[PDB]
A paper describes a structure:
The dedicator of cytokinesis (DOCK)/engulfment and cell motility (ELMO) complex serves as a guanine nucleotide exchange factor (GEF) for the GTPase Rac. The DOCK-A (DOCK1/2/5) and DOCK-B (DOCK3/4) subfamilies specifically activate Rac and have an Src homology domain at their N-terminus; the Src homology domain is involved in autoinhibition and binding to engulfment and cell motility (ELMO) scaffold proteins.
We performed 3D variability analysis using the 3.8 Å-resolution consensus map of RhoG/DOCK5/ELMO1/Rac1. The distance between the two DHR-1 of DOCK5 at the tip of the DOCK5/ELMO1CTD/Rac1 protomers, measured between the Cα atoms of Lys460 (one of the phosphatidylinositol (3,4,5)-trisphosphate binding residues), was shortest for class 1 and longest for class 5. Structural differences were due to the conformational changes between the armadillo repeat domain and DHR-2 in DOCK5, accompanied by a shift in the PH domain of ELMO1. Collectively, these results suggest that DOCK2/ELMO1 and DOCK5/ELMO1 are intrinsically similar in structure and exhibit conformational flexibility. Consistent with this theory, our cryo-EM single particle analysis reveals that the DOCK5/ELMO1CTD/Rac1 core region is highly flexible and can, therefore, readily transition to a flatter conformation.
Numbering used by the authors:
A (entry chain E): 629 to 1262
B (entry chain D): 530 to 727
C (entry chain E): 1 to 248
The structure:
C-alpha cells in the first residue's frame, strides 16, 4: 500500500524537479494504476494543485491539471476506491494547499460549460459533471483557503462572479437545443445541487437561488422533465435547511412545473417523479429545523391543491402509485393547519367551481375507502389515512357549513357525498376488529382512541346543523345511519338512535303533508338486510328501543305511532335474533323452516309484502331442498 | 424444581380436561371407519359421527368416500351412551374371535374395537392405523368419562403441562419458591380497610 | 388489612408460588401475574392482576416481589441497558398472544407450523433470558432486536396479524405518528420485509445456496479455514509442505 510501481507517479509527485514533464505527466497520470494512485492520492493532489498555482497563468497546465484531477476523482468514485474517497475529502478539508484553485478550476469549468458542444470538451465537462460535488468541495475550500491566506478575498468579487458567468454559461449552453448536450443537461441537473451546498459556504443563498432560477427559466419547458425534477429535488435536499430565503423563490418556479404537470397528458414519465417531488418537498417543508414555512405552506395550498386534485382526477387509477400520491397529499394535510385550509380551501373561486372541487374530492375519497389501497396489513397506514382524510373532510365540512349550508340558499346535496362517504369509511374497523388481540382494543385506544367515535360525533353535529333539510335528506341517509347505529360501539350508537328520533320528528313536521312512512319503510328494509348480516345484538336492540321510545315520549302522539313502529322494529329484531341464533345453532332443516315461517308470519302481520315474498322464497328454497313440492307449491 | 413441580402437577384440572375435549371433538367430526373384512366389495369406508347433540352416533353402511364423513342421519344414526357398557379392544373383540369367513387377520389386532351396547351387538370395527384407533377409544372413554388410552394423549398432556409451567414461572425468575411455601404474613385481624375497598 | 394507597410504583406485582387463597380476590395465583396494584399496603398488595386487569387481589408483600418498574424501563432507568427493555415487555406481550396462537394450532392439525412455532418459541425464550441482562454487546442487542422483530412479524405474516414498524429501538418511534411519508415508506419497508420473509422461508428454511449467495453479496473478504490433521506420505526425509490456494 506504500510501494509504487510506476515512473509516472514518481514524476508527477516530483513534477517540480520534472517541470519539463508537467504537461506530459498530466496526461501520463491517466495510465497510473488507481491502486497505486490512492497510495499517494494526497501527494498527487498537492502536486497538481501546486502545478496549476505555480503556472496558473499557463492555462494549458491548468486545463491539464483540471483534466487529470477530474479523471482521478472519477477513478476514486469506484467501489474499490470509495474507501479512499474519505481520504480524498480528508485531503480536501486538510491537505489541500492551492490558494487560487478556486479561481483556476471555476475558470476552467466555466470554459468547459461555455464550450460544451465541443466533443473534446464534451467528455471533459461530463467527467467534471459526475463529480461536481467533489470538485467544488475542493473549489469552495480553495476559495476559503484564499480567504485565510489573504484575510479578505480581494477576489471576493472575482470568484463569485466566475460562478455567476458560469451560471450564464449554463443558461446559454442549455438555451441551445437539447440534441447536442442532452446528457450534459442531465448531468447539470443531477450534480448541480450536489454543489449548491458546497457553494453555500461562499455565496449568497438568495442570489444563488435566483441565478439558478434564471437558468431554469432558460429552460425550454419540454426537455428532461423527471431530470429537472431530480435537480430541484436534490436542491431542496440541501440548501433548504436555509428555507425562508430560497423556498419562496423556488416554489414559484416549482409550482410552475407542478401546474404544468397538473394535466399536460405527458405526466406518464412524471407521475412517480412528481409524487417523489411531493414526498421530499413535504418532508423538507415539514422538516422542523429546515425552516418555518406555515404561510408558505398556505402558499403551497393555494397554488397546488386544485392543481393536484385535478391531477388525481388524472391519477384516479388504482394500479399505479396512486397510493403513493395519496400518501403525498395526505402528508400535506397532516403537515398543515386549518388556518391554512379555511384560508383558501374555504375561499376558492366562484361557489360553483369550489363545489365542483368538493364533488371531485368527495367522490375520490369514497372511491379510496372502497377498494382500499392498502394490503390490509397497513392498519398503521390505515389509521394514518383515517386521520388525514378526517382532516381534509373536516375542512370541507367547515366550508360546507359556511358556504353551502343554510348559508347557501340551495345545493345542500354535496351532503349526500359527505354523509355516505363518511359512513362508508366508517364501516370498517369495529369492536370485533378491535377484538383481534386482547391488547388490540388497548393498542388502538391508546395509540388512536376510537376514530369511529370522532367520525360519528362529527357527523352528528353536522346532522344537527342541517336543521330543516333533514327532511330534504332523510331517505338518502336512512340506510347509512342505521348501520352506523349498528356499530358495536355503545356511545356513538347511544347518540345515534336520538338521530333516528330527530329525523322522524322532522318528517313529523313533514307529517303535516304525509308522514315518515317512506322513512320507516326504508328503515325497515335496510334493517332487514342488515340484521340479516348480523352485526348488532340483544343489548343493542335494547339500547335502540330505549332511546327511540324515550325520545318519542319526549314528543307527541305521532311519536307514539313511531314508538309502536319501533316496537314492531324491535319485535322484528329479536325475531331475527333468535331466528339467526337457531340458523347458526341447530343447522337442521325443521327448525330453520320453523323460524322462517314465524318471521314470514310476522311480515304477514306487518304486510311487508316484498320482504315477505323474499323469505317466502327462502322458505320455498328450503322446501325444494326438502322436495316439498307440496309445501313449495303452497 | 421440587416446589415448582409441586405447584405444576398440583394444578392439573384443565389439561386432561382439554385433551379429552379434543378427543370428543375428534369423535364428533369423525371420519370413514372400516367395517369387518371389507373384501367382497364391502365398504371399508363408512362414517361414524358423534352427534352435534353428542347423543347419537352417525354410523352407517356408507360407501367408499375418500373425502371422509358424509353428513346425514346414517344407516344407524342412533347410539345412545346410556347403554354403552364399554368397548372391547384388541383380542377381546367378538370380531377378533371369529373363526368363520369373517375371521379378522393378524394385522387388525390393534384395529380391534367393538362398542359394547345392548350386550350382544358390538360395533365390530377396524381402524386404519393405531393412533386414530387409540383416539377413537379415548373419545369413547370420554363419553364414558374415563382415562384416555392413547400414548399420544399422554404425550400431549405431559408436553402441555411442561409448556404451561414454563409459561407461568417467568416472574419468579431470580427468585426461589421454598418447598415449604413462604410464611403467610399475619394479616391484621381487623378487617378494617383505612382506604376503601377496590 | 389496613393502609391502602393508590400508587403506580408497584406494577410488577410478583408472586412466589401458587398463592394461598388468603383473600376473596386471591387464588393459587399465576406465577407471571404482574399485577397492577391499585392499593398500597406494607405487607400486602391488592390491584389489577395480569390475568384480570379489572379486579384486585390482596397479595402479601412477603410474596410480592415488588418492582417499581412501569411498562417502560427507562422512566426510572429500569433498563439493564438504555433503549432495550421495551424489547422484554414487547416479547412478554408477544408470548401472551403466542398463547392463543398455539392453543389454536393444536385445534387445527397444522402440526408442522405449530412445531416450528415451538422451536422459534424456545429460541425466543432463551434469547429473552440472555437479554434479561445487557451482557451481550449492543451489536448483539440491535441484532437480536432485529431478529425478535423478524420472528414476531413473521408469526404475524403467517397469521395475518398487525404490523409493527420502527425496526429498531422498540418498534415504536415510527409508529409514534411522527410523520406521514416517512411512516408511509416505513410501512413500505414493512411490506418489503413481508415479501423478503414470505419469499425467503422457502429460500432459507428449505434452500441452502441462495441464503449463502445473499450473505456473500454483503461480504467480500473471506478466509478458508484449513485444519491439517495428519500427513500420510512415504518420504523418508524432512518434508516441506507448502499449502496455498490454487486456481487451475
Amino acid at each position: 500500500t506504500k510501494l509504487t510501481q510506476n515512473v509516472d507517479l514518481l514524476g508527477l509527485l516530483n513534477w517540480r524537479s520534472n517541470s519539463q514533464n508537467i504537461k506530459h505527466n498530466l496526461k501520463k497520470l491517466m495510465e497510473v494504476d488507481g491502486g497505486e494512485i490512492v497510495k499517494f492520492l494526497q501527494d498527487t493532489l498537492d502536486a497538481l494543485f501546486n502545478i496549476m498555482m505555480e503556472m496558473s497563468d499557463s492555462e494549458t497546465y491548468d486545463f491539464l491539471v483540471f483534466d487529470a484531477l477530474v479523471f482521478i476523482i472519477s477513478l476514486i468514485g469506484d467501489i474499490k476506491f470509495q474507501h479512499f474517497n474519505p481520504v480524498l475529502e480528508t485531503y480536501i478539508y486538510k491537505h489541500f494547499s492551492a490558494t487560487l484553485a478556486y479561481v483556476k478550476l471555476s475558470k476552467v469549468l466555466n470554459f468547459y460549460v461555455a464550450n460544451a458542444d465541443d466533443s473534446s470538451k464534451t467528455e471533459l465537462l461530463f467527467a467534471a459533471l459526475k463529480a461536481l460535488k467533489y470538485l467544488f468541495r475542493f473549489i469552495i475550500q480553495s476559495r476559503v483557503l484564499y480567504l485565510r491566506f489573504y484575510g479578505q478575498s480581494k477576489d471576493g468579487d472575482e470568484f463569485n462572479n466566475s460562478i455567476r458567468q458560469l451560471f450564464l454559461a449554463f443558461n446559454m449552453l442549455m438555451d441551445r437545443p437539447l440534441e447536442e448536450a442532452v446528457k450534459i443537461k442531465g448531468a447539470a441537473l443531477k450534480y448541480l445541487p450536489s454543489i449548491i451546498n458546497d457553494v453555500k459556504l461562499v455565496f449568497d443563498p438568495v442570489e444563488l437561488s435566483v441565478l439558478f432560477c434564471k437558468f431554469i427559466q432558460s429552460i425550454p419547458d419540454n426537455q428532461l422533465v423527471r431530470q429537472k425534477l431530480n435537480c430541484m429535488t436534490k436542491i431542496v435536499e440541501s440548501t433548504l435547511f436555509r428555507q425562508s430565503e430560497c423556498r419562496e423563490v423556488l416554489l414559484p418556479l416549482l409550482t410552475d412545473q407542478l401546474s404544468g404537470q397538473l394535466d399536460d397528458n405527458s405526466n406518464k414519465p412524471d407521475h412517480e417523479a412528481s409524487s417523489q417531488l411531493l414526498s421530499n418537498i413535504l418532508e423538507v417543508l415539514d422538516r422542523k429545523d429546515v425552516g418555518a414555512t406555515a404561510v408558505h405552506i398556505q402558499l403551497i395550498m393555494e397554488r397546488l391543491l386544485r392543481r393536484i386534485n385535478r391531477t388525481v382526477i388524472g391519477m384516479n387509477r388504482q394500479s399505479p402509485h396512486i397510493g403513493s400520491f395519496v400518501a403525498c397529499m395526505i402528508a400535506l394535510l397532516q403537515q398543515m393547519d386549518d388556518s391554512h385550509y379555511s384560508h383558501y380551501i374555504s375561499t376558492f373561486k366562484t361557489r360553483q367551481d369550489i363545489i365542483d372541487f368538493l364533488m371531485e374530492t368527495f367522490i375520490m375519497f369514497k372511491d379510496l375507502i372502497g377498494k382500499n389501497v392498502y394490503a390490509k396489513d397497513w392498519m398503521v397506514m390505515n389509521m394514518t389515512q383515517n386521520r388525514v382524510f378526517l382532516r381534509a373532510i373536516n375542512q370541507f365540512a367547515e366550508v360546507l357549513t359556511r358556504f353551502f349550508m343554510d348559508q347557501a340558499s340551495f345545493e345542500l346535496q354535496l351532503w349526500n357525498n359527505y354523509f355516505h362517504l363518511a359512513v362508508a369509511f366508517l364501516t370498517h374497523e369495529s369492536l370485533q376488529l378491535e377484538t383481534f388481540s386482547q391488547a388490540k382494543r388497548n393498542k388502538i385506544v391508546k395509540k388512536y382512541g376510537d376514530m369511529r367515535k370522532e367520525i360519528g360525533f362529527r357527523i352528528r353535529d353536522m346532522w344537527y346543523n342541517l336543521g330543516p333539510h333533514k327532511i330534504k335528506f332523510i331517505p338518502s341517509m336512512v340506510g347509512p345511519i342505521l348501520e352506523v347505529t349498528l356499530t358495536p360501539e355503545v356511545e356513538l350508537r347511544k347518540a345515534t338512535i336520538p338521530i333516528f328520533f330527530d329525523m322522524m320528528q322532522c318528517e313529523f313536521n313533514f307529517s303535516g303533508n304525509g308522514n315518515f312512512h317512506m322513512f320507516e319503510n326504508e328503515l325497515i328494509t335496510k334493517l332487514d338486510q342488515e340484521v340479516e348480516g348480523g352485526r348488532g345484538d340483544e343489548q343493542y336492540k335494547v339500547l335502540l328501543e330505549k332511546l327511540l321510545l324515550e325520545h318519542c315520549r319526549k314528543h307527541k302522539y305521532l311519536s307514539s305511532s313511531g314508538e309502536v313502529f319501533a316496537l314492531l322494529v324491535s319485535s322484528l329484531l329479536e325475531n331475527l335474533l333468535d331466528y339467526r341464533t337457531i340458523i347458526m345453532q341447530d343447522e337442521s332443516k325443521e327448525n330453520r323452516m320453523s323460524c322462517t315461517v314465524n318471521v314470514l308470519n310476522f311480515y304477514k302481520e306487518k304486510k311487508r309484502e316484498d320482504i315477505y315474498i323474499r323469505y317466502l322464497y327462502k322458505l320455498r328454497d328450503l322446501h325444494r331442498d326438502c322436495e316439498n313440492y307440496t309445501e313449495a307449491a303452497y | 424444581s421440587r416446589p415448582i413441580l409441586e405447584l405444576k402437577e398440583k394444578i392439573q384440572p384443565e389439561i386432561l380436561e382439554l385433551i379429552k375435549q379434543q378427543r370428543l371433538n375428534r369423535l364428533v367430526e369423525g371420519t370413514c371407519f372400516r367395517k369387518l373384512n371389507a373384501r367382497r366389495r364391502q365398504d371399508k369406508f363408512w362414517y361414524c359421527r358423534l352427534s352435534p347433540n353428542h347423543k347419537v352416533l352417525h354410523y352407517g353402511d356408507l360407501e367408499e368416500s375418500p373425502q371422509g364423513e358424509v353428513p346425514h342421519d346414517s344407516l344407524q344414526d342412533k347410539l345412545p351412551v346410556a347403554d354403552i357398557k364399554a368397548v372391547v379392544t384388541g383380542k377381546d373383540c367378538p370380531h377378533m374371535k371369529e373363526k368363520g369367513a369373517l375371521k379378522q387377520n393378524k394385522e387388525v389386532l390393534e384395529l380391534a374395537f367393538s362398542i359394547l351396547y345392548d350386550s350382544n351387538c358390538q360395533l365390530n370395527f377396524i381402524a386404519p392405523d393405531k393412533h386414530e384407533y387409540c383416539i377413537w377409544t379415548d373419545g369413547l372413554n370420554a363419553l364414558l368419562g374415563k382415562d384416555m388410552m392413547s400414548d399420544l394423549t399422554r404425550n400431549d398432556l405431559d408436553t402441555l403441562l411442561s409448556m404451561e409451567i414454563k409459561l407461568r414461572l417467568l416472574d419468579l425468575e431470580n427468585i426461589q419458591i421454598p418447598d415449604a411455601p413462604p410464611p403467610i404474613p399475619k394479616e391484621p385481624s381487623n378487617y378494617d380497610f383505612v382506604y376503601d375497598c377496590n | 388489612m389496613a393502609r391502602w394507597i393508590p400508587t403506580k410504583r408497584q406494577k410488577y406485582g410478583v408472586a412466589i408460588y401458587n398463592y394461598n387463597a388468603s383473600q376473596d380476590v386471591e387464588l393459587s395465583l399465576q406465577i407471571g401475574d404482574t399485577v397492577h396494584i391499585l392499593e398500597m399496603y406494607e405487607g400486602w398488595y391488592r390491584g389489577y392482576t395480569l390475568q384480570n386487569k379489572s379486579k384486585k387481589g390482596i397479595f402479601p408483600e412477603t410474596y410480592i416481589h415488588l418492582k417499581e418498574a412501569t411498562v417502560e424501563d427507562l422512566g426510572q432507568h429500569e433498563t439493564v441497558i438504555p433503549g432495550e427493555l421495551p424489547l422484554v415487555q414487547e416479547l412478554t406481550s408477544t408470548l401472551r398472544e403466542w398463547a392463543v396462537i398455539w392453543r389454536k394450532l393444536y385445534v387445527n392439525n397444522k402440526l408442522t407450523l405449530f412445531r416450528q412455532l415451538q422451536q422459534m418459541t424456545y429460541s425466543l425464550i432463551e434469547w429473552r433470558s440472555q437479554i434479561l441482562s445487557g451482557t451481550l454487546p449492543k451489536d448483539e442487542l440491535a441484532e437480536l432486536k432485529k431478529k425478535v422483530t423478524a420472528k414476531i412479524d413473521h408469526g404475524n405474516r403467517m397469521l395475518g396479524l398487525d404490523l409493527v414498524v420502527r425496526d429498531d429501538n422498540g418498534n415504536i418511534l415510527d409508529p409514534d405518528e411522527t410523520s406521514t411519508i416517512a411512516l408511509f415508506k416505513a410501512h413500505e419497508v414493512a411490506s418489503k420485509r413481508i415479501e423478503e420473509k414470505i419469499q425467503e422461508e422457502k429460500s432459507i428454511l428449505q434452500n441452502l445456496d441462495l441464503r449463502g449467495q445473499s450473505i456473500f453479496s454483503t461480504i467480500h473478504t473471506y478466509g478458508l479455514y484449513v485444519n491439517f490433521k495428519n500427513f500420510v506420505c512415504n518420504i523418508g526425509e524432512d518434508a516441506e509442505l507448502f499449502m496455498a490456494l490454487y486456481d487451475p
